[PDB]
Short mmCIF file of C-alpha atoms in Angstrom, two decimals:
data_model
loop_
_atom_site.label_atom_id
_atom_site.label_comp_id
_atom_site.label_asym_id
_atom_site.label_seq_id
_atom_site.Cartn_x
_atom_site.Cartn_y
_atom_site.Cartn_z
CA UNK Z 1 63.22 4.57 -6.76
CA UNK Z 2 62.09 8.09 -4.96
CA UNK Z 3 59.24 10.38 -6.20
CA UNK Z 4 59.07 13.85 -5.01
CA UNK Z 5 55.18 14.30 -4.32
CA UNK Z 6 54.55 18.51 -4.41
CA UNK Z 7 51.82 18.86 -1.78
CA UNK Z 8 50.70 20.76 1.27
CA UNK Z 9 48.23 17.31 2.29
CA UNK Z 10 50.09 15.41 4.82
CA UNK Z 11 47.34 13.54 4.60
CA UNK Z 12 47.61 12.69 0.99
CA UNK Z 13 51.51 12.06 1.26
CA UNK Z 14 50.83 9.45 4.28
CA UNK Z 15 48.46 7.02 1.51
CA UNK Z 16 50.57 7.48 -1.24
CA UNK Z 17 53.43 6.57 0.95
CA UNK Z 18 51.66 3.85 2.21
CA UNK Z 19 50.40 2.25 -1.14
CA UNK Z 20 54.22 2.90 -2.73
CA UNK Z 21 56.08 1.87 -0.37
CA UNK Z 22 55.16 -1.48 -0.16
CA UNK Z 23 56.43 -1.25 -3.94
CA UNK Z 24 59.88 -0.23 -3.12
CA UNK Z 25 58.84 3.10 -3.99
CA UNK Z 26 59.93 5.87 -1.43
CA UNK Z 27 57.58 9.13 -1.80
CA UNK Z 28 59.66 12.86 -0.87
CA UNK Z 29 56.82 15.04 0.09
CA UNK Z 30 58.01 18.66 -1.24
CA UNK Z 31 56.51 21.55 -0.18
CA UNK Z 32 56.76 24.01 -3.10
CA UNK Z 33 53.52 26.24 -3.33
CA UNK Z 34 51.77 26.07 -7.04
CA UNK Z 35 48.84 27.44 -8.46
CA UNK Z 36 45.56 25.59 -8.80
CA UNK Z 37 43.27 27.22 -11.28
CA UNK Z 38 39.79 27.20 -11.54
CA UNK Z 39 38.82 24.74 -14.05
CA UNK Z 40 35.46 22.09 -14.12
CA UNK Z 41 37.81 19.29 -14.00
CA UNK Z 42 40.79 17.86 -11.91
CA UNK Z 43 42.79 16.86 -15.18
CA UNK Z 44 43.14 20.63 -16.06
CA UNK Z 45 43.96 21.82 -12.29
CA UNK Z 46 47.06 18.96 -13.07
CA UNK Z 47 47.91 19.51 -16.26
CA UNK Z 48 48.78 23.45 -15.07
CA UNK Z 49 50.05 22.43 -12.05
CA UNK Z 50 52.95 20.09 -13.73
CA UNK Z 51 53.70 23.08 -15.99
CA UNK Z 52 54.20 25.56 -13.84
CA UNK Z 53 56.70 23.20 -11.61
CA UNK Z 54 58.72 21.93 -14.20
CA UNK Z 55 62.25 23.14 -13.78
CA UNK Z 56 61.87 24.60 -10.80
CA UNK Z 57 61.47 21.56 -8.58
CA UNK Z 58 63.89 18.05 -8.68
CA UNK Z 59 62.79 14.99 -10.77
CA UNK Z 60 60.83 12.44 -11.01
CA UNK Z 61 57.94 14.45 -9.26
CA UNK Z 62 53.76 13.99 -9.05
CA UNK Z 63 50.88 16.13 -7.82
CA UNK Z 64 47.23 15.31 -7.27
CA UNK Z 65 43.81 16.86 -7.15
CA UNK Z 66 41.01 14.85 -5.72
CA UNK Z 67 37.13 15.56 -5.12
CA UNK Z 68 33.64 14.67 -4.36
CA UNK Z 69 31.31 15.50 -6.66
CA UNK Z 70 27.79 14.28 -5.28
CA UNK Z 71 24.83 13.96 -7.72
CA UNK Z 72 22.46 15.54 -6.63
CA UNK Z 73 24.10 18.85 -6.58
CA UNK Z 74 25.53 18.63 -9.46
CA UNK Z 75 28.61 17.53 -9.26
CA UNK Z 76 29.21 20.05 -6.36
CA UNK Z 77 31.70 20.56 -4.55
CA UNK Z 78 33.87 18.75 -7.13
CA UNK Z 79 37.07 20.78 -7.64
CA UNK Z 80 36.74 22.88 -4.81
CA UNK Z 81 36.38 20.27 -2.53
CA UNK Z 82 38.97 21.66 0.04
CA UNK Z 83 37.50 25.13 0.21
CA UNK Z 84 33.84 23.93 0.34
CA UNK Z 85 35.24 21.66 3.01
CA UNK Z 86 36.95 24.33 5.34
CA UNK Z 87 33.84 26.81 5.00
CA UNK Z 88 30.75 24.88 5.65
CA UNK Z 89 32.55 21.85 6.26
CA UNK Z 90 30.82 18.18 6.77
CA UNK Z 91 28.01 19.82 8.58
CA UNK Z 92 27.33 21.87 5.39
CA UNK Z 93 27.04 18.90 2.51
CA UNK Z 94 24.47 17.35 5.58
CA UNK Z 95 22.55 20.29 5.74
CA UNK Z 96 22.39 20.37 1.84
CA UNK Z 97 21.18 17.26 1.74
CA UNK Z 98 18.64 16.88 4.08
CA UNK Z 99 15.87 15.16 2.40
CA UNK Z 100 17.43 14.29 -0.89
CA UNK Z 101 16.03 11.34 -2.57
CA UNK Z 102 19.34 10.64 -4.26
CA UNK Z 103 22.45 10.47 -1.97
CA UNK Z 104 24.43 9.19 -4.51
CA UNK Z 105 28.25 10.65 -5.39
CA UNK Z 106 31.84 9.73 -6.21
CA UNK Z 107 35.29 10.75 -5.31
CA UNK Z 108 37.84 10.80 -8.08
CA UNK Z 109 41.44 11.37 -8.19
CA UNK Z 110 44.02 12.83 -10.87
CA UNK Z 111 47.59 12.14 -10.14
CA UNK Z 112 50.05 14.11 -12.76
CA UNK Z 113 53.96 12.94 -12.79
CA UNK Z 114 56.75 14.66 -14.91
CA UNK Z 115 60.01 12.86 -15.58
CA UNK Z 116 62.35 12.97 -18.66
CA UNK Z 117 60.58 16.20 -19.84
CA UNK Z 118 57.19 14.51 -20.07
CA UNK Z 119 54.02 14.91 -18.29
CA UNK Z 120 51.24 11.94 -17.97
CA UNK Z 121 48.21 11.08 -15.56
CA UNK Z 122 46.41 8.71 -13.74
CA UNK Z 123 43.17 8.86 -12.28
CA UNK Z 124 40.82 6.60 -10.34
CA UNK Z 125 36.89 6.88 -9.57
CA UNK Z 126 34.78 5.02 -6.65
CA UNK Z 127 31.34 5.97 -6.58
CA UNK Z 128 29.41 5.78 -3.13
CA UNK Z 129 26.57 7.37 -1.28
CA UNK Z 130 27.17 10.30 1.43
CA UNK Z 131 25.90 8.96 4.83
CA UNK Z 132 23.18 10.96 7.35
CA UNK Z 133 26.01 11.80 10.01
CA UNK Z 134 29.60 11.32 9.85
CA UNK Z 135 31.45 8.59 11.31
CA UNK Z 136 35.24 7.66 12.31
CA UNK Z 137 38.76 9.14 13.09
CA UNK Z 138 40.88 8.50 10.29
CA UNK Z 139 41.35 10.08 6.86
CA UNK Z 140 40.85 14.08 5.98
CA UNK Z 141 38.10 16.22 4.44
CA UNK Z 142 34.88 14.33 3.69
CA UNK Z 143 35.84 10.72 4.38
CA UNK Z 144 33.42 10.68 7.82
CA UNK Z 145 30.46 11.14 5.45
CA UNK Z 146 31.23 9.27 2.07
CA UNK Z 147 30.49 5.12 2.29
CA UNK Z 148 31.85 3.64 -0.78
CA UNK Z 149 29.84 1.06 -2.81
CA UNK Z 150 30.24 -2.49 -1.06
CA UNK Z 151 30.96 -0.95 2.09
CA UNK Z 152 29.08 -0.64 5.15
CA UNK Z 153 31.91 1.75 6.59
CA UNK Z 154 33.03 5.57 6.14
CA UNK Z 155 36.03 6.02 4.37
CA UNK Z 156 36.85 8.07 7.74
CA UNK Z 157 36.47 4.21 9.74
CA UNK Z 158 39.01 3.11 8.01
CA UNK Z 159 42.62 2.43 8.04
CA UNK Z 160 44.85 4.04 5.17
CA UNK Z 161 45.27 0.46 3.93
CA UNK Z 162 41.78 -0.55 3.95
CA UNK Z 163 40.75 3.13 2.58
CA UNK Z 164 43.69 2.45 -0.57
CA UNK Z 165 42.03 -0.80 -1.05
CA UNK Z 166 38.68 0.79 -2.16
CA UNK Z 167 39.38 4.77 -2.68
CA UNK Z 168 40.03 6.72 -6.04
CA UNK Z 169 43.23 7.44 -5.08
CA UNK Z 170 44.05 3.67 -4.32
CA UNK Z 171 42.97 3.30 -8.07
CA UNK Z 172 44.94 6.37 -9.47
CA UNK Z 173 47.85 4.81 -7.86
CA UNK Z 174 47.50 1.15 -9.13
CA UNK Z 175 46.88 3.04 -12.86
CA UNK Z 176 50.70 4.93 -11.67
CA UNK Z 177 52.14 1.89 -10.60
CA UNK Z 178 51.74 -0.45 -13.36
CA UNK Z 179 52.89 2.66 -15.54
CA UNK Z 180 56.12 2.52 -13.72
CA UNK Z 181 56.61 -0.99 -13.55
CA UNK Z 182 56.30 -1.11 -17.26
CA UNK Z 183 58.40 2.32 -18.27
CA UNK Z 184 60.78 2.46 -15.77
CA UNK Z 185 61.61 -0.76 -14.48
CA UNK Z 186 62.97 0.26 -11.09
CA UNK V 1 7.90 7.49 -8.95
CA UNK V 2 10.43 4.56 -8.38
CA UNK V 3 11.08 1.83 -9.88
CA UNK V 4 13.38 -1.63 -8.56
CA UNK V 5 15.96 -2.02 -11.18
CA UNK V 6 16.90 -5.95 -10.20
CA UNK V 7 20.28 -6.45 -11.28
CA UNK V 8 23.80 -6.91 -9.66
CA UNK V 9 25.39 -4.36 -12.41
CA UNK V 10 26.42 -0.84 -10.67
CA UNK V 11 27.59 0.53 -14.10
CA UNK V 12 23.83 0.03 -15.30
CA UNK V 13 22.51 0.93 -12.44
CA UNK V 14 24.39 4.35 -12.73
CA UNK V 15 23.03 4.79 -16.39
CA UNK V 16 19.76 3.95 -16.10
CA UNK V 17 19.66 6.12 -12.79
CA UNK V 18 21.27 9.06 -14.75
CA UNK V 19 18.67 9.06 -17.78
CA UNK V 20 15.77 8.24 -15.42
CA UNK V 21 16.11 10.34 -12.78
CA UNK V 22 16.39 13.58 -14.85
CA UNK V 23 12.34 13.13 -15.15
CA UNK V 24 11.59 12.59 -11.38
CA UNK V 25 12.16 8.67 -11.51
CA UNK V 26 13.71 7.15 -8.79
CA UNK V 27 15.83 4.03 -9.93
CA UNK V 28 16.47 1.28 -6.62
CA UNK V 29 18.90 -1.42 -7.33
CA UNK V 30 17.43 -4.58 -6.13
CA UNK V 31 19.82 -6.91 -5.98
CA UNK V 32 18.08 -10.51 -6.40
CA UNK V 33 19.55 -13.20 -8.63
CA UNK V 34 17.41 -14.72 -11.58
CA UNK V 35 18.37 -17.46 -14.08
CA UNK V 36 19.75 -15.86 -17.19
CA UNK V 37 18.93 -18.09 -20.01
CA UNK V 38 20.93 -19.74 -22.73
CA UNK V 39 19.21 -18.57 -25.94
CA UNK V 40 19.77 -16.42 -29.30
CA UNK V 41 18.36 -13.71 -28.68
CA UNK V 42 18.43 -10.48 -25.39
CA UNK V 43 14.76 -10.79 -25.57
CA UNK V 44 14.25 -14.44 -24.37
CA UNK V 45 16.23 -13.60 -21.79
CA UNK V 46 14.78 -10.78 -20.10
CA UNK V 47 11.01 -13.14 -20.95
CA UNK V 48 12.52 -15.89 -18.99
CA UNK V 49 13.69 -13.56 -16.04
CA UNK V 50 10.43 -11.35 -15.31
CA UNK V 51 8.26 -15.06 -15.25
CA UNK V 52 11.11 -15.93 -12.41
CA UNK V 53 10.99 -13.03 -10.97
CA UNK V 54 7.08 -11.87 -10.69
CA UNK V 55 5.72 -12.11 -7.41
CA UNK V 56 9.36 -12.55 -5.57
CA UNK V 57 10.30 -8.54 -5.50
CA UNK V 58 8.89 -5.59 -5.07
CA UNK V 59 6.67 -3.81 -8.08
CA UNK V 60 7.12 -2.08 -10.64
CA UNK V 61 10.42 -3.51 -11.61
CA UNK V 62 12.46 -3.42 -14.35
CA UNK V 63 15.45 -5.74 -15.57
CA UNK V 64 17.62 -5.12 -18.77
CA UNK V 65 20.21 -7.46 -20.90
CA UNK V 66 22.15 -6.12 -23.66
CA UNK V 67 25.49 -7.07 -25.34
CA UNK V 68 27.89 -6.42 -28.11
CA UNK V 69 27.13 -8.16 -31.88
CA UNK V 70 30.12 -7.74 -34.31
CA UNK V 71 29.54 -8.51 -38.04
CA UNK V 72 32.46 -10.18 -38.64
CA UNK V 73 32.12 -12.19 -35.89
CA UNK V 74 28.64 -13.97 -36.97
CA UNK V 75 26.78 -11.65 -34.12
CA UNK V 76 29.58 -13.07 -30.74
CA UNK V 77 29.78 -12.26 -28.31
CA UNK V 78 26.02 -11.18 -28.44
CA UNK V 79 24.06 -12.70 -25.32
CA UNK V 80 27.19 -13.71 -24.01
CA UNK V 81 28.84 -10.53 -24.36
CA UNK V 82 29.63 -10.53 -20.45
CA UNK V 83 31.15 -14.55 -20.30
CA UNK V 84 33.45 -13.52 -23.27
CA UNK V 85 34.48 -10.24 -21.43
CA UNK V 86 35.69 -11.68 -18.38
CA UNK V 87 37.40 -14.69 -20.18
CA UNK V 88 39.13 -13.03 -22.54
CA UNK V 89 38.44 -9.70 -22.21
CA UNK V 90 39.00 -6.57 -24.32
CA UNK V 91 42.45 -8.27 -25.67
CA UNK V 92 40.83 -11.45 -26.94
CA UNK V 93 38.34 -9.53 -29.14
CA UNK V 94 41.28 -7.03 -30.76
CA UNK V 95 42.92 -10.32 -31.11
CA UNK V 96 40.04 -11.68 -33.00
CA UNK V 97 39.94 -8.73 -35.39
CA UNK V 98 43.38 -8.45 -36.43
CA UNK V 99 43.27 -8.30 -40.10
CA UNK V 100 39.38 -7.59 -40.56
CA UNK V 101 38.03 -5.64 -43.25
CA UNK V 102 34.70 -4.91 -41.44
CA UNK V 103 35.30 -3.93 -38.04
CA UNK V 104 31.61 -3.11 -37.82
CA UNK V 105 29.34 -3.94 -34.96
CA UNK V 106 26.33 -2.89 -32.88
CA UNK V 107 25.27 -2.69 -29.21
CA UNK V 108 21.72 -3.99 -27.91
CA UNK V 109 20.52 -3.10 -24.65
CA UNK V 110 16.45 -4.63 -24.29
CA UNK V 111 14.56 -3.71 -21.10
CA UNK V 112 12.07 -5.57 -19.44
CA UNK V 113 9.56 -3.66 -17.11
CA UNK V 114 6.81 -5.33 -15.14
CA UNK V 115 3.90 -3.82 -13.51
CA UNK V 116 0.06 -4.48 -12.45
CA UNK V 117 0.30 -8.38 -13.12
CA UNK V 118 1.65 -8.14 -16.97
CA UNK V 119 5.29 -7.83 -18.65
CA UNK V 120 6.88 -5.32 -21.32
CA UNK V 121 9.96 -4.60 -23.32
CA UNK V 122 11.55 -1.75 -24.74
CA UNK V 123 15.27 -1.95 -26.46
CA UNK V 124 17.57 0.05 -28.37
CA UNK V 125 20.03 -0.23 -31.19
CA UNK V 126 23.37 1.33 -31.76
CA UNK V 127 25.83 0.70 -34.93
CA UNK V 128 29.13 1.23 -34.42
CA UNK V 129 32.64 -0.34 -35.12
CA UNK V 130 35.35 -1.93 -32.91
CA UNK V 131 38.28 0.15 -32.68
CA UNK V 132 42.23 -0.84 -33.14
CA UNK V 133 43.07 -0.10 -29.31
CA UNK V 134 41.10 0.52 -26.10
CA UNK V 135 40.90 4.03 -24.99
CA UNK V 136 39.01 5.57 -22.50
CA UNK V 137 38.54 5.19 -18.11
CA UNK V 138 34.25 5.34 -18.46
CA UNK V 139 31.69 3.12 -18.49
CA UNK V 140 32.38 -0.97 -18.53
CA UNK V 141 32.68 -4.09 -20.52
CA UNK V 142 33.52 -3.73 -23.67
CA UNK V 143 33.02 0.29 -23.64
CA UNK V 144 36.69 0.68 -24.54
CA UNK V 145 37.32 -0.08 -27.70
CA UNK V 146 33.36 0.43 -29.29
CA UNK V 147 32.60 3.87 -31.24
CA UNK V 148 29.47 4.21 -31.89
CA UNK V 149 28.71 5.87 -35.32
CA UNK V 150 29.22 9.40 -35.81
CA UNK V 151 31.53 10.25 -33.10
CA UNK V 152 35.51 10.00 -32.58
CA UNK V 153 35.57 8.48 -28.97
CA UNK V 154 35.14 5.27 -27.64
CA UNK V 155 32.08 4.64 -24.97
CA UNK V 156 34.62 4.53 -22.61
CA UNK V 157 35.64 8.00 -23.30
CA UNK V 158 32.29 9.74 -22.46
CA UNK V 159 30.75 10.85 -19.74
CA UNK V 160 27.33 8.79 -18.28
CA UNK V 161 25.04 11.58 -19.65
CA UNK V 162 27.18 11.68 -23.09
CA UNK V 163 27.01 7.39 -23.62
CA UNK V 164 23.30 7.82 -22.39
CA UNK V 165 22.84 10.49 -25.43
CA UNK V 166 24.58 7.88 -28.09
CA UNK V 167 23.95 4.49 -26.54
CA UNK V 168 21.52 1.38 -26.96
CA UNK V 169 20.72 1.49 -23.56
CA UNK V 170 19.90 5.29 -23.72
CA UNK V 171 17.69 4.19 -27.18
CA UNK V 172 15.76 1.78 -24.59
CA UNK V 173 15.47 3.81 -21.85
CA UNK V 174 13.82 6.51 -24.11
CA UNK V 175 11.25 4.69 -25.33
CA UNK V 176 10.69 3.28 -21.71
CA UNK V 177 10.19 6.62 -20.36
CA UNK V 178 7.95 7.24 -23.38
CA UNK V 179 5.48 4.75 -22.43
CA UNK V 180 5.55 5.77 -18.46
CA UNK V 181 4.77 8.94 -19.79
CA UNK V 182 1.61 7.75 -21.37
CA UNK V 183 0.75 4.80 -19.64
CA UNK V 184 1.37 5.72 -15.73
CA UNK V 185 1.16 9.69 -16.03
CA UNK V 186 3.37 10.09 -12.68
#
């Protein structure tokens, strides 16, 4: 069974791929530009993203929004993750939290799929702690910095099995999976 | 101020860091295993465990039971509300209900805080009823299918700082913070 995933995120198509695949699921990364509104949570980014594709893009297809939303700052960067992340970067959420008594935050993920003329979603949540420096060379965006709960390694140290194993978007995709197990029987 | 929350529950630790740390305490999981003891009430429990635990961990500490009483059910899964949730689970319970005119139950959280040399307890109360189906991606345990009187949602379907507004647990950890108001000034 194929998916068309609509995203820019090579990154993100490489883990879904990965976690799929092994499924007998093979992901179609299409790159068809939609807009992300502003919203204060992923679900509503998704839900406008799936209706503004519909139609125009072929079927069965997903999206995703993902973010970190650290405690401390209340919730910040949260949906705006990627933009906070290309303008101060990983040396930026450091400096912000320099001294904090709290490191505490989570990374969640939405997934939206549309197939039959229906939309649905799928999220996952793993809650963590951002680390004093950043460590490792795998993974995108703040992985070097986030360590999630049980771990003694950076999302960023390691590999995009091990990182499906514990991340939010490993979870969003077991929630997807079971879905399609049980509605589509592929 | 901080306080050692002993327990090996991140979903508690998470709530009582939320509600706590809003008034400059600083919740650290400890995580050192004490006998939980067979007995009829959440109280005896928590007794038992800060007499096991005094003088082994840091001070002051804090450790908290709680569990789910339904009406119907003669008070079960009560103390054992976490045994009966991991044997069988949200499904078991529904299953258990089919056909009951009072689907009414409450939630109990007690905590148990010890400082300077001498023990205390605080606990909270809150009435609900056990719902047809399990909704919700929040909280744990049986969070899915209790609603707590006067709302629409499940536990499971708020937020930490919306359960902690509506929850037994919240109930305790107000009149905890009460009393380190008074008694500690920090």
């Amino acid at each position: 069974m194929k998916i068309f995933f609509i995203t820019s995120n090579p990154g993100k198509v490489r883990e879904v791929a990965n976690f799929l695949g092994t499924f007998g699921i093979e992901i179609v990364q299409l790159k068809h530009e939609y807009p992300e509104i502003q919203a204060e949570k992923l679900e509503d980014v998704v839900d406008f993203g799936i209706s503004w594709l519909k139609g125009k893009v072929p079927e069965p297809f997903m999206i995703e929004d993902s973010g970190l939303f650290i405690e401390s700052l209340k919730g910040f960067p949260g949906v705006y993750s990627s933009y906070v992340y290309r303008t101060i970067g990983l040396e930026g959420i450091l400096k912000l939290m320099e001294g904090a008594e709290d490191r505490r935050a989570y990374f969640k993920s939405v997934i939206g799929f549309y197939i039959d003329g229906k939309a649905y979603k799928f999220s996952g949540v793993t809650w963590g702690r951002i680390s004093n420096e950043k460590r490792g060379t795998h993974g995108f965006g703040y992985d070097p910095i986030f360590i999630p709960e049980g771990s003694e390694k950076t999302f960023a140290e390691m590999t995009i099995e091990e990182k499906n194993a514990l991340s939010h978007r490993g979870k969003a995709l077991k929630a997807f999976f079971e879905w399609l197990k049980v509605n589509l029987k592929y």
